Enzyme design. Structure first.
Site, PDB file in Angstrom:
ATOM      1  N   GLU A  93       0.820  -1.205   0.000  1.00 32.61           N
ATOM      2  CA  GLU A  93       0.000   0.000   0.000  1.00 32.61           C
ATOM      3  C   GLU A  93       0.856   1.257   0.000  1.00 32.61           C
ATOM      4  O   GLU A  93       0.532   2.232  -0.688  1.00 32.61           O
ATOM      5  CB  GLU A  93      -0.950  -0.002   1.197  1.00 32.61           C
ATOM      6  CG  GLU A  93      -2.040  -1.063   1.131  1.00 32.61           C
ATOM      7  CD  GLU A  93      -2.644  -1.363   2.489  1.00 32.61           C
ATOM      8  OE1 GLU A  93      -2.124  -0.847   3.500  1.00 32.61           O
ATOM      9  OE2 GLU A  93      -3.642  -2.113   2.546  1.00 32.61           O
ATOM     10  N   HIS A 125       3.536 -10.574  18.022  1.00 30.93           N
ATOM     11  CA  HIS A 125       4.267 -11.773  18.408  1.00 30.93           C
ATOM     12  C   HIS A 125       5.752 -11.638  18.109  1.00 30.93           C
ATOM     13  O   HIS A 125       6.594 -12.002  18.938  1.00 30.93           O
ATOM     14  CB  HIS A 125       3.691 -12.989  17.691  1.00 30.93           C
ATOM     15  CG  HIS A 125       3.770 -14.253  18.486  1.00 30.93           C
ATOM     16  ND1 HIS A 125       2.723 -14.715  19.253  1.00 30.93           N
ATOM     17  CD2 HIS A 125       4.772 -15.151  18.636  1.00 30.93           C
ATOM     18  CE1 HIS A 125       3.075 -15.845  19.838  1.00 30.93           C
ATOM     19  NE2 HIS A 125       4.313 -16.132  19.482  1.00 30.93           N
ATOM     20  N   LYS A 174       8.397 -11.682  28.972  1.00 29.37           N
ATOM     21  CA  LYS A 174       8.594 -10.807  27.833  1.00 29.37           C
ATOM     22  C   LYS A 174       8.479  -9.359  28.284  1.00 29.37           C
ATOM     23  O   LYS A 174       8.777  -8.448  27.515  1.00 29.37           O
ATOM     24  CB  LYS A 174       7.596 -11.144  26.742  1.00 29.37           C
ATOM     25  CG  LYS A 174       7.819 -12.510  26.119  1.00 29.37           C
ATOM     26  CD  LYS A 174       6.781 -12.809  25.050  1.00 29.37           C
ATOM     27  CE  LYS A 174       7.023 -14.167  24.412  1.00 29.37           C
ATOM     28  NZ  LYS A 174       5.998 -14.483  23.379  1.00 29.37           N
TER      29      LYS A 174
END
EC number: 2.5.1.46
Lengths: 301, 330, 317, 307, 303
Positions: free
Chosen positions: B105, B256, B297
């Site tokens: 895009e 992720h 994390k």
């Protein structure tokens, strides 16, 4: 001779009974011929067990050309999973694991992977050592890195077994294990965080270039007192654990001093513990099998 | 702390109105916590630091803190692009993670425009007129007719370069090559190559850019791409960093990939999330910030915040107070 | 068609209750259109003309394969009932682990610091212990060493599809679905295999035996040709994300698919790639088609959706 | 019209930023449609008035910082009719007596033994309601005395007005309600703690009577006689349906703005043309976002720059 | 300490085992299993022995959607055999059910269902004759009127066995609704207010009735379908008695705005501290018939 055939687990181990010997033992099937690497383990295991001799260290009585050894009820894994321990039981288990360590170290043989899954127990409340295959004279894949020494983990002296036994002692004192990890960097991070930042005086023995750079390029963290981690333990227990878990490999507790520590001084008598009677590759295939046959030749009619 | 709002009897004052949001509640206090967090993030960067390139195989001077940014494809073609260009033109970010739709895009927008529209319009009628639909935006089918006429020679030269001289292609490098060809001061990937900010996108095959690759294969075959080299670059961009921060602007693979990168260094130190997902389905996109700390994390000392709102009505306001008031400090 | 529920005075017969959902209304009647739509696919597949008369596309996200729905997926694959599969990064690592150590239940309100200290990870309302991941290392490392040997000597290029096929053969367990994948010639494609624990584990392997190469330019040629040379196609998508867009773009080459059924719970106000009308616009689906969409959790509708239109015509295969 | 944003390289000027939101699409263009609609309302509006504007809110808004904005809107006679929920009338009075302090993850069991009540991410002390009880007890006594002696029939609107008249505190949104003759309607008032207070007062001095048909007649007759009507609704529930039914009896409304956050998949009230609530020649607008983050900005561009 | 397992279709199609297999499926099926267990426990507590009292009084509420949908048939089954004690409803929950007895509905818009405009004309020609008499009674008999009694009166005039509220009166099961002026019923009431003025409806007595029904019960239970006024009304009615025992919620709302998790209710003391409420985040139509067909339906001759 062999009767009472049953199932134990899986090579494969099964229950058996010798009619002539009138005793109950277990038999394990070994097939290392497929890979030389498997044969290297087999050669050391038959050689190491047969030459050793002691009450605490497990023994081999016969080989069916299929290995005949005594059987125990359960290992430390299941007992630690189900039942919590007490002060006297922990004391007794620690005095004995150490007694075995003294003979193996006196025997001048290097052990590795001394994890609690390789410690056995029976109804008489006694502990023994079973597996000795990956061993050396004082990129190898090990099943678990949870209870390994950090100078092995980060690229051999005698401190590694002391590290192992300290880890087992901590895991006995506290229900959960102390250093759980998933990645190699993850375990390094956990160990460094729990034991505190590495001082430069400590960082002299390490010789790997990239690893040395990594350990140098770290922030500073404060060591956690053991009392905070364990609020229901003994002062002697905390002191012994702190002395055992040391980053400096050239400055850490040796086995003889540990047995005579004040914590275990009650069951320690100098005359009681024994010493070893006697002081202690390539890739062949055909002659390696020949050597295996020669080593195992005595155990048959 | 009490709960108060703007009095509005003093006249319209924009500085105070966006500052009084921190004591209103509900999603406003989340906005206040977010702006405080990002403001705390930038202050650490300006501190001076007082070899590393060879280890990380990257040409960039390490700063006091590295900031990670990611976005979802539908956001790029939604007018937010000006804010991203402003954030990238002057060095304010260090890693960008996107999806192949994003690059597809963004490249065309330099060559042809996109028109507005309405939400409810039957596609059966729109197909005849030759209009595609992306949310409330409509794009022409003529726009895709110039991309095919512009990308083929680049791929021809790429194949020639691979066969003649020694070179192995990675997704982090095909993006950089496209930037120098566009030669325009309004495309965000032009400024990406000028100041050496790498762009990662593991799912590069899926998208309209994949369509062009398939047709080219049946005339000049032999192209090769490798995804194991990019992993090394992104991981070592985070292992050797003093302090890190995350700004994830949408759910999906981008969330992720970025979070998993920081796992190898015991989490990040500052984080913020902006998405409109839900948690009862259990999808990773809707995971609460406290779910990340379970996996290791997000460090246990940080205070992450997460705002439930559409990114269009929040992101431009957030950059108004945090990153724009200290432009002269760079 | 008037609105009429089920009157319980007749008794309890489960067969009538499931069929009566068609005329109940609201989101219940959307489920009613699904059973009619899917049934047409199976009816058309058995028509007399390896290549069948209809190709079925099936995809899922990482959550479902870690939940209890894995048993249902096995049934749909063991009996040659679907043709190709699409999955995400975690959809394989979570699958292979379950054949060595199981998962446990829990709650949603658990905090994070205590779980981190104990050493238990959390996904959704399920818990996975840390010792499970260590068992992966013992089993994956030996097979990757053989992986690099074949490339250097025998000269075989490697793509994710072939890697999944190779991994499926080694586990040797009827429970694992990917075992039946290799035993029945059902390819499995996943564009982003870098993410997840599998990538974290192939990283560290690179520092000892370097030189592994994976290609994403050959997978596109397999997915595209599997659909350009087919008579009729269909779609069954669960969840949303890259898995949806990949399938939709794959079906574009043949001027759109024919039969489709979507099951997810995302919202449409944010314009994320996760309504069927948009697919008609770009060309994902045909004009004459009648797509349906059900807004419900995938763990409560799928076992019921397979209870009809499947597992009933079992002897017909 | 193409798509374009705000180029920050020129600097920061908040007037341009709040206007450029129209050009960018997605949930920002709907903001521009909303601002155009409310500006049209203002222009048309500028005793009977050229345009009557309805306003409604859900009780959870009032306990937050948006309460002050509603006060400013009611201050200068900018709105005519207010419709609320039982909780809304109960919380404004408390704030004028005791304040409320400020996570989503706090467990209710722990807060139970400390005496803390949770509404969203805000906390209200349990000791606060004791003052409410002590202050509200005497007024209902004279209320019942007047009912028995004077003979004045009573509805929720008049009791809300009487309650507001006595507090005498400028921060109270119901103070200025009684001064400017702006009625406040509520369909169900017994739901909140006021109902509990009535219960505890039922046994002693019994006979309080409330009616529900007179309020309906009043709202309907207010809506029917009006040149131009407009609707602003913040949230969903009984209030939205009540407003829609109020405006239905004149073939529809002209302009309307909705700011809620629910979804249409469940089929609940949270399409108006199908019941004629909204006129055919109208273009209703609708924004998906939390009210706390959008409503204050809406008052910035409109309702503030004109007086 | 339980594993995760699903139904293995190789066995066959055994529906009864399949419905139980959701308990270990995970995600939003474990909540379904917990709901089933809780409802079963509540009915078991109702079974044990000590309008007549009952060992446990159960509550039930709904939104105007479910009555217009197919759930009308199954909620009729519950009130048929005295399964519940108190019902609450919104304004549209009364008008819609009355219509269905006269003229049908086809799949003027409620959403996924369409009602004809001419359908509302028939209700007009039937409502004035009963309303015209009602005002006459007040003038010449001195009877007070409350929404509960007015709803109860409406059932006695239908005399048809397919209307829920007709079966409400045959067992003296009250129906409560705080906001009745909303919806088409209030619109029809408005017109009568000019021809024959004088109707008065009180709301202070309804609170008294519901609260005294709440306080004098040994054990209580909550089963509410959908959010809105009904949720807070039941919660505040049960605020006394120091909390309820058993509660099951079924709705699709979210907690980012104040429709909240069952745990938050405990802070107010609305639910006991030793209770375990259960939440389910699926649509009502696709879940409720299964829940009724598994717990209540198995026991019919016992009542």
């Amino acid at each position: 001779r062999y009767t009472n055939l049953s199932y134990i687990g899986e090579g494969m181990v099964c229950s058996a009974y010798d009619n002539v010997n009138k005793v109950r033992v277990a038999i394990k099937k070994i097939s290392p011929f497929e890979h030389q690497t498997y044969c290297q383990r087999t050669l050391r295991e038959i050689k190491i067990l047969l030459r050793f001799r002691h009450e605490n260290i497990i023994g081999i009585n016969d080989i069916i050309r299929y290995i005949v050894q005594d059987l125990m009820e359960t290992d430390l894994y299941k007992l630690l999973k189900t039942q919590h321990l007490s002060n006297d039981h922990i004391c007794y288990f620690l005095y004995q694991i150490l007694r075995g360590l003294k003979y193996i170290h006196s025997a001048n043989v290097l052990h590795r992977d001394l994890k609690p899954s390789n410690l056995l127990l029976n109804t008489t409340c006694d502990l023994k050592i079973c597996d000795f295959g990956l061993a050396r004279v004082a990129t190898e894949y090990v099943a678990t890195r949870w209870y390994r020494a950090p100078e092995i983990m980060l690229n051999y002296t005698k401190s590694i077994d002391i590290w192992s036994v300290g880890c087992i002692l901590a895991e006995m004192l506290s229900n959960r294990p102390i250093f759980p990890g998933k990645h190699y960097l993850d375990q390094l991070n956990h160990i460094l965080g729990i034991l505190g930042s590495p001082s430069q005086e400590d960082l002299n023995c390490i010789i790997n270039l990239k690893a040395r750079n990594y350990l140098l390029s770290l922030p500073h963290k404060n060591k956690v007192p053991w009392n905070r981690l364990f609020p229901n333990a003994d002062s002697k227990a905390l002191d012994l654990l702190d002395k055992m878990l040391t980053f400096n490999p050239h400055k850490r507790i040796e086995v003889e001093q540990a047995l005579a520590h004040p914590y275990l001084e009650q069951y320690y008598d100098p005359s009681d513990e024994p010493i070893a009677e006697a002081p202690f590759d390539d890739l062949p295939k055909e002659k390696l099998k020949e050597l295996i046959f020669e080593e195992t030749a005595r155990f048959q009619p | 702390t009490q709960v108060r709002g703007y009095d509005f009897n003093r006249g319209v004052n924009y500085r105070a109105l966006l500052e009084a949001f921190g004591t209103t509640g509900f999603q406003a206090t989340n906005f206040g916590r977010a702006v405080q967090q990002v403001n705390a993030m930038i202050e650490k960067k300006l501190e001076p630091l007082s070899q590393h390139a060879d280890l990380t195989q990257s040409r960039r001077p390490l700063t006091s803190c590295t900031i990670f940014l990611g976005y979802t494809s539908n956001l790029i073609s939604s007018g937010i692009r000006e804010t991203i260009r402003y954030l990238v033109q002057h060095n304010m970010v260090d890693v960008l993670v996107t999806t192949a739709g994003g690059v597809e895009e963004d490249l065309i927008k330099c060559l042809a425009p996109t028109y507005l529209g309405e939400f409810s319009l039957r596609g059966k009628e729109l197909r005849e007129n030759g209009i595609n639909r992306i949310g409330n935006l409509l794009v022409p089918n003529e726009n895709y007719c110039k991309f095919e006429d512009w990308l083929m020679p680049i791929l021809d030269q790429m194949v020639m370069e691979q066969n003649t001289e020694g070179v192995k292609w990675t997704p982090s490098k095909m993006i950089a090559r496209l930037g120098k060809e566009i030669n325009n001061p309004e495309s965000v990937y032009y400024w990406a190559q000028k100041n050496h900010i790498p762009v990662f996108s593991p799912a590069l095959t899926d998208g309209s850019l994949g369509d062009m690759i398939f047709f080219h294969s049946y005339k000049n075959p032999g192209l090769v791409l490798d995804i194991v080299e990019d992993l090394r670059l992104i991981n070592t961009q985070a292992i050797f960093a003093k302090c890190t921060g995350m700004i994830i602007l949408g759910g999906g693979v981008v969330k992720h990939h970025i979070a998993n990168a920081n796992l190898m260094r015991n989490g990040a130190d500052y984080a913020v999330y902006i998405n409109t997902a839900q948690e009862f389905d259990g999808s990773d996109s809707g995971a609460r910030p406290d779910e990340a700390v379970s996996w290791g994390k997000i460090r246990v000392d940080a205070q992450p915040v997460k705002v439930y709102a559409d990114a269009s009505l929040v992101f431009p306001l957030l950059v108004a107070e945090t990153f724009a008031q200290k432009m002269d400090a760079f």
